[PDB]
Each structure stands twice: as structure tokens, then as C-alpha cells.
Write an enzyme that holds these catalytic residues in place. Structure first.
Site, PDB file in Angstrom:
ATOM      1  N   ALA A 173      45.240  32.513  33.570  1.00 49.08           N
ATOM      2  CA  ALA A 173      44.216  32.803  34.563  1.00 49.08           C
ATOM      3  C   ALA A 173      43.124  33.743  34.036  1.00 49.08           C
ATOM      4  O   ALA A 173      42.048  33.817  34.641  1.00 49.08           O
ATOM      5  CB  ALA A 173      44.873  33.379  35.831  1.00 49.08           C
ATOM      6  N   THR A 200      55.015  34.100  46.906  1.00 50.95           N
ATOM      7  CA  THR A 200      53.729  34.739  46.666  1.00 50.95           C
ATOM      8  C   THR A 200      53.609  35.091  45.191  1.00 50.95           C
ATOM      9  O   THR A 200      54.597  35.444  44.543  1.00 50.95           O
ATOM     10  CB  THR A 200      53.562  36.003  47.525  1.00 50.95           C
ATOM     11  OG1 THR A 200      54.692  36.871  47.354  1.00 50.95           O
ATOM     12  CG2 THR A 200      53.428  35.646  48.997  1.00 50.95           C
ATOM     13  N   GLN A 202      41.782  33.195  53.458  1.00 53.01           N
ATOM     14  CA  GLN A 202      41.871  34.153  52.364  1.00 53.01           C
ATOM     15  C   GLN A 202      42.117  35.561  52.907  1.00 53.01           C
ATOM     16  O   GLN A 202      41.369  36.047  53.768  1.00 53.01           O
ATOM     17  CB  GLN A 202      40.595  34.129  51.525  1.00 53.01           C
ATOM     18  CG  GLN A 202      40.539  35.186  50.442  1.00 53.01           C
ATOM     19  CD  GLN A 202      41.469  34.867  49.288  1.00 53.01           C
ATOM     20  OE1 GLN A 202      41.261  33.899  48.556  1.00 53.01           O
ATOM     21  NE2 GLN A 202      42.506  35.680  49.124  1.00 53.01           N
ATOM     22  N   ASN A 212      67.131  27.942  43.581  1.00 54.57           N
ATOM     23  CA  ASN A 212      67.380  28.065  45.014  1.00 54.57           C
ATOM     24  C   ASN A 212      66.084  27.944  45.807  1.00 54.57           C
ATOM     25  O   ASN A 212      65.965  27.112  46.721  1.00 54.57           O
ATOM     26  CB  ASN A 212      68.067  29.399  45.313  1.00 54.57           C
ATOM     27  CG  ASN A 212      68.218  29.645  46.801  1.00 54.57           C
ATOM     28  OD1 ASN A 212      68.901  28.893  47.501  1.00 54.57           O
ATOM     29  ND2 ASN A 212      67.579  30.698  47.294  1.00 54.57           N
ATOM     30  N   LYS A 227      40.616  26.364  50.738  1.00 56.90           N
ATOM     31  CA  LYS A 227      41.493  27.518  50.951  1.00 56.90           C
ATOM     32  C   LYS A 227      41.173  28.056  52.344  1.00 56.90           C
ATOM     33  O   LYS A 227      40.325  28.951  52.505  1.00 56.90           O
ATOM     34  CB  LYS A 227      41.291  28.581  49.862  1.00 56.90           C
ATOM     35  CG  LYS A 227      42.028  29.892  50.100  1.00 56.90           C
ATOM     36  CD  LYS A 227      43.210  30.141  49.174  1.00 56.90           C
ATOM     37  CE  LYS A 227      43.904  31.479  49.516  1.00 56.90           C
ATOM     38  NZ  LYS A 227      45.191  31.646  48.778  1.00 56.90           N
ATOM     39  N   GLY A 230      49.297  34.036  31.355  1.00 66.02           N
ATOM     40  CA  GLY A 230      47.988  34.574  31.058  1.00 66.02           C
ATOM     41  C   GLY A 230      46.842  33.588  31.135  1.00 66.02           C
ATOM     42  O   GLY A 230      45.695  33.976  30.872  1.00 66.02           O
TER      43      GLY A 230
END
Ligand SMILES: O=P(O)(O)OP(=O)(O)OP(=O)(O)OC[C@H]1O[C@@H](n2cnc3c(O)ncnc32)[C@H](O)[C@@H]1O
Ligand SMILES: O=P(O)(O)OP(=O)(O)OP(=O)(O)OC[C@H]1O[C@@H](n2cnc3c(O)ncnc32)[C@H](O)[C@@H]1O
Ligand SMILES: [Mg+2]
Ligand SMILES: [Mg+2]
Lengths: 228, 226
Positions: free
Chosen positions: B202, B12, B41, B148, B38, B200
Site C-alpha cells: 500500500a 478490520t 468512510q 476460523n 465506499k 507493504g
């Protein structure tokens, strides 16, 4: 021959693997079970990281076995290359573990980070090592968000190599919980058995309180059941 | 049909949405037509809206979703807090196949990591990628623990024969650091690293973003997607 070998793995780096080893060792010691703990790959020594020394602290375990140590707090492959050293071979880790194995002994093996971290060249992981010594895997997990996808990915990668899962342990349980950290434990306990949820900051409990914490944290029956 | 990529991640908050927007922005500038689905949401009460992020940053207009949940939890716990069910497997799969047309790059964003429950009962983004025969682009970090998580996600993909389209580092820090630059080289050893988006990205406006995304991917690969 042999007693019981458990790799103690995790969904990631920094989830409570070492405190869980020390808590399960402590509970097993209080059940009369002889306990050895093994950390074949230790990074971060130049900042004082020593997971064996911590397990001997919290649980008093004396049978502590190391092998490879690297100064930088990086993944083993990067730490070794930064030090000019190689990773251990696969059979060096296996021999380290096999020498500890003993009827009536519970030997706990802590990897570095999570299950697929490379511990030996080439690309040898704790899951390979678990396969070579016929060990089952305790999976230390968080209650934070993300824990479900990481746990499921971890259980999946074990089963793909027929490494049995001995359950899950929450490395840090906050008192009181929250809605995610409750729905997660509820969701985790639907995925597999939660053998324990060590209170937050168990790692700072002194020798005395740790022993008491550990005995309550684990189902005394399950512990004694791990080794005949 | 065109090309369908599921855009998954190791966890996430690793930048799956900004990577959708970035790849959609590169693809549009290559004359490709783009849609983003999507299906579920969550976190709408605090105003989470991944499809609107893609709309703003990259100018996609084909923006499809099926369900909105107020609580900022995973879909399952969000649906259970609201007393309502997740969408069904068939809805999600059909929405995407209907989005898919020839000449179109269609990107799908789940929620969190590959194996989080996306529809009922316990159907994942991996199951959806099987059904629609999508490949998977894998958004990762450069922080400690990424190897991992990346290897765990790539094995889960291949166990169900969902092809790996490559890796994208969702946030590349300034300056890298010893761990981040070490991780970048090692990630590149286990799959193609298609981009490392600057930290940054976004927050940029649409014009800056379109310029960053055009430089972030290799032209030939993007042009070859569809
Ligand atoms: O400690 P790391 O570097 O994460 O290595 P690890 O993978 O072996 O870590 P564990 O799963 O065993 O999780 C428990 C350890 O996390 C360590 N740690 C916890 N909090 C830390 C912090 O703020 N800063 C540095 N180390 C921390 C701490 O020493 C624990 O023994
Ligand atoms: O946004 P979240 O809740 O993490 O759910 P997600 O599954 O859609 O997460 P993504 O991988 O799509 O992308 C990472 C997100 O983290 C967001 N984020 C960025 N800065 C943040 C900050 O200071 N605090 C909390 N979240 C931030 C960022 O905008 C992305 O939307
Ligand atoms: Mg440890
Ligand atoms: Mg997102």
C-alpha cells in the site's frame, strides 16, 4: 442422565477462553457445584502451553481431562501433521466428554482457538462436538475493535446448527475502559448477555484473589442456575 | 449490468482497500473499466480515505461514497458520536446499481468485517450484496486464527446465497514463516486464493503498484471477471 455440558468457545485465538473456564469453574465450585474441565486438543506443548494445568492453578479444579497434545503452537491440524500424528476421531472427543458428564456436575469443554477450528478429521469442529453432546456454548469475546463482527459471525454459526448460546464473557477488561471498549461492551450487551468481564491480568491473580475475582465476576444466581 | 464484487474481509485492517486498488489495477491493465464505491468512510479526522488510496495506487476515477464520519470507530458508533444517522439501505443499494454498467467491474468496500452495521437500521454489507446480486471477494490474513475467521465469513456468505468469488491474502509476509505458509495451503483447500499481496504494497507508488498487481492475479481470471 447427565449434568450440564458447556463448550467454552471464542471469537478467536487468545481471547481468554482458559481464564474464563477457570473463573466460571471457581464461581461454580464456590456455589457447591461439582466441576469438570476438559481440553480435548492441546497445541503448543513444546513452548509450555497447558490450558488444563492453568485451570487447576487458578481455580483448583482437579477433574481435568485431556486427550490429544501436540508440540508446535499451530492450529491442531498443522501441529498434528508437523508431529507425524493424526487428529483424534470425532467419537474420541465425544467419549471423553460423555465420560465426564454427571447429574449435578458442570463440565466445561475448551476448544482450540475459535468455533470452526478443525479438531477431528475430517473438518470436525467444536460446534459438531457441541451438537453430539447436546451442549450449549459460552462465547468468550474481546472488547477490542472487530469484536462485533466476530461475535455476530460466531453466534450465527452456532444457530445454524441449533447450538444454544449461554451468553458472552469478555476475557480481558481494562480498567478504566475507553470509548470503543465502552461502546463495544454496550454493543455486545445489546447482542447477548455479558455474564462477566474478567479484569485484565486475572490470569496472574493468585489462588486467593482469583477465587474472590471469580465470585464477583459472575451473577451467583446465573451460575447456580446452570445445573440442577 | 456489468460485474459487481463486494470486497469484504475477516476483520478490520486486513487490507481490503489495498486489494480493491490491486484488483482494480489488474482489471484496468486488462482493458476493463472499473468503479469503486465506499458508501461509508469513518476516521476522517485522522485522515482515513479509502477511495483516495484507490485513486492514487490504481488510477480509478469513478470513486463513489455517501457519508464521512470524523471518529475512527465502526460506522454505527461513529454516527452516534457525531449525533447523525448512517445512510439508509436504499441509498447504498441504488448508488451501486447506478454505478453498475455493462463492461464495468464495480467493487464495493464496506467497513471492517462482513457483518458490521453499514446503514441504518443494522443493515450489513451482506444485505447490500444480496440486493445488488453481487459476489463477494474475501480478504484474509495468513496469521494464526485466519482459518476460523475465514470459515466463519464464508458460512455467513453462503447462508444468504452470496457467492464467494475467492480469497485474497491482503498481506503476505517476508519471509512467510511456518504458520503463514501452513495457512496458505489450508486456505487454498477451502476456497480459491486469487492473490497474496506482498507486505507493504500500500506504500508503493502508482507505477510499482500497477506492476505488482499485474503479477499478483491470474490474467485469465481477471479477464473473465466482466
Ligand atoms: O494462548 P493461545 O495460544 O492463544 O491459545 P487459546 O485459544 O486456548 O487462548 P485463550 O482463548 O484461552 O485465551 C487465554 C490465553 O491466551 C494466552 N496468552 C495470553 N497472552 C499471551 C502472550 O503474550 N503470549 C503467549 N501467549 C499468551 C494465555 O496463556 C491465556 O491462557
Ligand atoms: O484502515 P482501517 O482503519 O484498518 O479500516 P479498513 O476496514 O478500511 O481496513 P482495510 O481492510 O481496508 O485495510 C487495512 C488497512 O490497515 C492500514 N495500515 C497499514 N499500516 C498500518 C500501520 O502501521 N498502523 C495502522 N494501520 C496501518 C493499511 O494501510 C489498510 O488501510
Ligand atoms: Mg486457552
Ligand atoms: Mg479499507
Amino acid at each position: 442422565h447427565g449434568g450440564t455440558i458447556l463448550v467454552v468457545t471464542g471469537t478467536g485465538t487468545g481471547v481468554g477462553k482458559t481464564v474464563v473456564c477457570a473463573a466460571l469453574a471457581s464461581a461454580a465450585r464456590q456455589a457447591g457445584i461439582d466441576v469438570a474441565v476438559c481440553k480435548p486438543v492441546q497445541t503448543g506443548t513444546a513452548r509450555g502451553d497447558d490450558d488444563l494445568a492453568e485451570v487447576g492453578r487458578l481455580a483448583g479444579v482437579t477433574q481435568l481431562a485431556g486427550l490429544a497434545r501436540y508440540p508446535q503452537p499451530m492450529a491442531p491440524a498443522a501441529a498434528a501433521e508437523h508431529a507425524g500424528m493424526a487428529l483424534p476421531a470425532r467419537d474420541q472427543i465425544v467419549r471423553l466428554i460423555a465420560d465426564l458428564d454427571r447429574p449435578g456436575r458442570l463440565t466445561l469443554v475448551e476448544g482450540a482457538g475459535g468455533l470452526l477450528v478443525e479438531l477431528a478429521e475430517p473438518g470436525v469442529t467444536l460446534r459438531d462436538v457441541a451438537v453430539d453432546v447436546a451442549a450449549a456454548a459460552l462465547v468468550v469475546v474481546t472488547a477490542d475493535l472487530g469484536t462485533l463482527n466476530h461475535t455476530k459471525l460466531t453466534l450465527e454459526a452456532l444457530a445454524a446448527q441449533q447450538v444454544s448460546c449461554a451468553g458472552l464473557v469478555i476475557g480481558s477488561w481494562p480498567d478504566p475502559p475507553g470509548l470503543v471498549a465502552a461502546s463495544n461492551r454496550s454493543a455486545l450487551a445489546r447482542i447477548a448477555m455479558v455474564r462477566a468481564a474478567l479484569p485484565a491480568g486475572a490470569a496472574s491473580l493468585d489462588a486467593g484473589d482469583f477465587a474472590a475475582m471469580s465470585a464477583a465476576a459472575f451473577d451467583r444466581n446465573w451460575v447456580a442456575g446452570l445445573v440442577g
